[PDB]
Amino acid sequence: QSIDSGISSLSYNRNEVLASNGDKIESFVPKEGKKAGNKFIVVERQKRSLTTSPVDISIIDSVNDRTYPGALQLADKALVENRPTILMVKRKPININIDLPGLKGENSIKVDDPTYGKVSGAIDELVSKWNEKYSSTHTLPARTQYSESMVYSKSQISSALNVNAKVLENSLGVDFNAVANNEKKVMILAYKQIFYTVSADLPKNPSDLFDDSVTFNDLKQKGVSNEAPPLMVSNVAYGRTIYVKLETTSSSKDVQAAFKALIKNTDIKNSQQYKDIYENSSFTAVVLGGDAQEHNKVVTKDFDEIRKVIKDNATFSTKNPAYPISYTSVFLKDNSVAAVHNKTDYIETTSTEYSKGKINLDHSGAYVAQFEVAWDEVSYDKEGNEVLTHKTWDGNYQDKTAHYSTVIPLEANARNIRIKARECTGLAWEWWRDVISEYDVPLTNNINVSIWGTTLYPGSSITYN
């Protein structure tokens, strides 16, 4: 019935207690062939799956949030949903420590009655203790931590960068739908900038945390259970985060490469393919976790502007308030670090545009000729398998003379286009001399076929547009 006793006997799989699971698929279309106005679009999916297991937990609203080092919460789904349940009970003092530079042997402080406000003031002290020892400068470099990834889905990206999906959706304004319908290509970068961090020395036994007036039944009452094991916030990073979004409408498979080239500023950044992509991309940057609020957003077609934002935020002032960016918790029982577990599937995709064209035949040869034009019309069933529907031209196997012109329109889904023209030397078609034989002609907007010359010296040509 006691704190150490009740806790020391909790049955739970620490590697499953905290889990944020999402979407798992099996019923997906490997291939989608559809028309879109005058175009013919071809989507080609490929189920992909990611599995994250972070130990460092993100904090959403620094003002609404009062999490601190030493705090107590339950390892439940609320926590997983970025809104943990804090256990408020009269407790024992605890030692806290900041990692600002040049402060060894002076960085620790003891907080008698840990509470958000109580601990904060301690930290405040520590910082001032620093600002005192070091009066010349009050600004230091932030410790940035870079992360990057393409956006395929909410749960995907959310776990990839270990950030709450809503946050991006709100601040970066991510159009998860267009993304889904493959109408947009998006990449997100995250610059975690830590100024300093604070830890709370781990206790030998749970009891060391709580006062004596406290009993396990209280804890088991507040919510402590096998479904809500108790834990303590061991570390808290203070600083801010810069989120950068790289979006485009281009469907090229080079986008990613292009984005990276732009970000890193590599020499291959001028690949004309990239330049066009860049010309069709939009970049967004924002800085959260601070007290800046919404007033620091930037949308440009000029990345140099995004580069500045990052550069300008490479420092933090020891004379300004620093808010919680993230934290790592620890199970009371074994003092092991907690780690929210996430597993989810998603679908990488690609969509190739097509557009109808036509065959332009032109006969100006001093002989009689017969054409043979055929092609296939691609289709895709429910299982995403190819389905070729053969098509042929009317004017096939029909004589044609001095200057015959005609246009043969083709659907955007025309494949294996074959254009043949034979002269009339001797018996039947299947016995004549060839003026032109082309196979698998690339469906373009204009396939200009044309024969000419004499019976002995025929001539032909095919151009494109």
Side-chain angles (χ1 to χ4, degrees):
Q1 268 172 287
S2 169
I3 274 157
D4 319 74
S5 0
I7 276 152
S8 211
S9 53
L10 267 166
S11 63
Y12 61 86
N13 195 311
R14 63 204 177 151
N15 294 272
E16 288 146 37
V17 300
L18 285 167
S20 58
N21 285 314
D23 26 293
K24 174 181 196 222
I25 186 61
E26 298 157 285
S27 158
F28 85 101
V29 194
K31 173 99 46 276
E32 201 104 52
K34 113 200 41 54
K35 281 175 176 179
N38 213 272
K39 288 191 147 181
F40 186 96
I41 330 309
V42 188
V43 194
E44 185 164 28
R45 321 198 145 74
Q46 193 150 162
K47 184 183 98 174
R48 270 312 208 300
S49 102
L50 174 159
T51 305
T52 325
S53 197
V55 318
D56 195 272
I57 312 94
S58 283
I59 282 178
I60 303 188
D61 195 54
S62 304
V63 164
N64 203 273
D65 197 276
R66 303 191 145 175
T67 292
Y68 66 100
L72 292 171
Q73 356 171 276
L74 322 173
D76 64 327
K77 321 195 92 263
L79 156 51
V80 169
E81 274 148 338
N82 288 95
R83 37 177 183 66
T85 289
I86 310 277
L87 296 198
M88 265 173 301
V89 317
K90 208 181 162 39
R91 78 221 291 302
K92 288 168 168 84
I94 184 152
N95 252 67
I96 208 185
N97 348 82
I98 191 164
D99 63 352
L100 263 165
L103 217 55
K104 60 178 78 50
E106 297 164 295
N107 72 306
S108 292
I109 202 171
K110 185 186 150 221
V111 179
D112 290 336
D113 205 291
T115 65
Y116 166 74
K118 252 287 263 174
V119 174
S120 298
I123 305 192
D124 270 55
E125 268 184 63
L126 290 182
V127 177
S128 303
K129 183 173 187 173
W130 192 97
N131 272 318
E132 177 58 37
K133 190 165 159 172
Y134 307 110
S135 315
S136 331
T137 286
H138 57 90
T139 84
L140 306 162
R143 306 172 213 160
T144 305
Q145 278 180 342
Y146 181 91
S147 314
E148 102 183 13
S149 150
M150 306 283 322
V151 200
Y152 299 116
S153 68
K154 272 188 183 148
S155 42
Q156 174 263 327
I157 193 53
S158 152
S159 91
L161 304 176
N162 185 192
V163 297
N164 191 279
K166 304 320 122 183
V167 170
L168 318 169
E169 189 162 34
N170 274 47
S171 325
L172 279 188
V174 174
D175 183 340
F176 282 93
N177 236 43
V179 163
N181 307 334
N182 200 303
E183 320 166 353
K184 253 183 192 157
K185 292 277 214 95
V186 192
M187 191 185 66
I188 304 203
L189 325 183
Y191 292 80
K192 192 181 179 132
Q193 304 200 286
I194 302 154
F195 301 168
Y196 59 72
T197 76
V198 197
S199 64
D201 301 344
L202 295 201
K204 162 79 258 89
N205 294 290
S207 48
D208 308 332
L209 291 188
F210 323 70
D211 188 42
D212 306 313
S213 71
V214 195
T215 88
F216 180 76
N217 302 293
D218 300 313
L219 307 189
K220 189 187 176 170
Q221 210 290 311
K222 293 281 190 189
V224 179
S225 85
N226 296 286
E227 280 68 28
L231 18 80
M232 170 190 97
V233 189
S234 42
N235 296 277
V236 180
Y238 301 87
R240 57 166 163 267
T241 300
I242 303 173
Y243 289 99
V244 170
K245 174 174 90 192
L246 289 93
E247 68 165 328
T248 179
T249 33
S250 171
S251 353
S252 178
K253 67 200 240 286
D254 290 357
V255 173
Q256 197 172 319
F259 280 173
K260 307 199 81 168
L262 191 59
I263 297 146
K264 289 156 195 165
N265 240 16
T266 55
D267 187 51
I268 325 292
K269 39 25 193 175
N270 223 298
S271 280
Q272 271 290 167
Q273 7 176 44
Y274 290 20
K275 277 288 93 188
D276 263 10
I277 294 167
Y278 296 160
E279 269 193 287
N280 283 105
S281 306
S282 201
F283 321 108
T284 317
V286 280
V287 188
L288 321 180
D291 201 323
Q293 193 117 153
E294 357 263 312
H295 329 123
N296 57 244
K297 190 195 242 193
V298 191
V299 190
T300 319
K301 266 200 137 42
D302 179 357
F303 207 84
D304 278 9
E305 290 214 79
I306 308 295
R307 307 194 198 280
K308 195 192 180 352
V309 178
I310 300 165
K311 285 163 62 250
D312 295 351
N313 282 290
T315 287
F316 84 81
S317 164
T318 69
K319 293 211 152 184
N320 278 59
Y323 309 85
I325 279 321
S326 69
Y327 73 98
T328 23
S329 283
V330 161
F331 286 118
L332 282 196
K333 185 148 158 176
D334 61 324
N335 260 203
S336 87
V337 171
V340 185
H341 305 272
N342 189 328
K343 169 178 204 168
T344 168
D345 296 335
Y346 61 92
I347 279 180
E348 296 194 13
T349 298
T350 100
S351 44
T352 65
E353 248 85 79
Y354 275 103
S355 326
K356 6 159 125 182
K358 64 266 217 181
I359 296 182
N360 303 134
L361 308 171
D362 183 277
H363 175 4
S364 69
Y367 48 89
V368 185
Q370 304 200 325
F371 291 97
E372 192 204 37
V373 176
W375 59 98
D376 281 336
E377 269 184 359
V378 69
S379 340
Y380 295 99
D381 58 53
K382 304 174 275 74
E383 335 297 325
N385 303 307
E386 196 178 62
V387 178
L388 304 166
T389 286
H390 201 55
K391 290 303 190 71
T392 39
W393 182 49
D394 309 66
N396 268 28
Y397 316 121
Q398 288 171 41
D399 292 320
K400 302 291 177 158
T401 51
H403 207 303
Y404 166 79
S405 289
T406 190
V407 163
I408 323 173
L410 283 166
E411 282 307 84
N413 64 320
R415 286 78 226 279
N416 313 129
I417 312 155
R418 31 182 164 302
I419 296 167
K420 196 179 283 167
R422 246 109 104 128
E423 188 229 306
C424 282
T425 294
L427 331 171
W429 153 262
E430 358 252 322
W431 284 260
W432 293 322
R433 142 182 342 185
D434 280 285
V435 168
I436 192 172
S437 197
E438 286 302 317
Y439 299 75
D440 215 326
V441 180
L443 156 60
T444 64
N445 301 290
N446 285 300
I447 297 160
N448 325 118
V449 171
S450 44
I451 64 192
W452 65 84
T454 81
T455 303
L456 291 176
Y457 308 92
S460 96
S461 94
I462 177 145
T463 308
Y464 293 82
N465 288 302

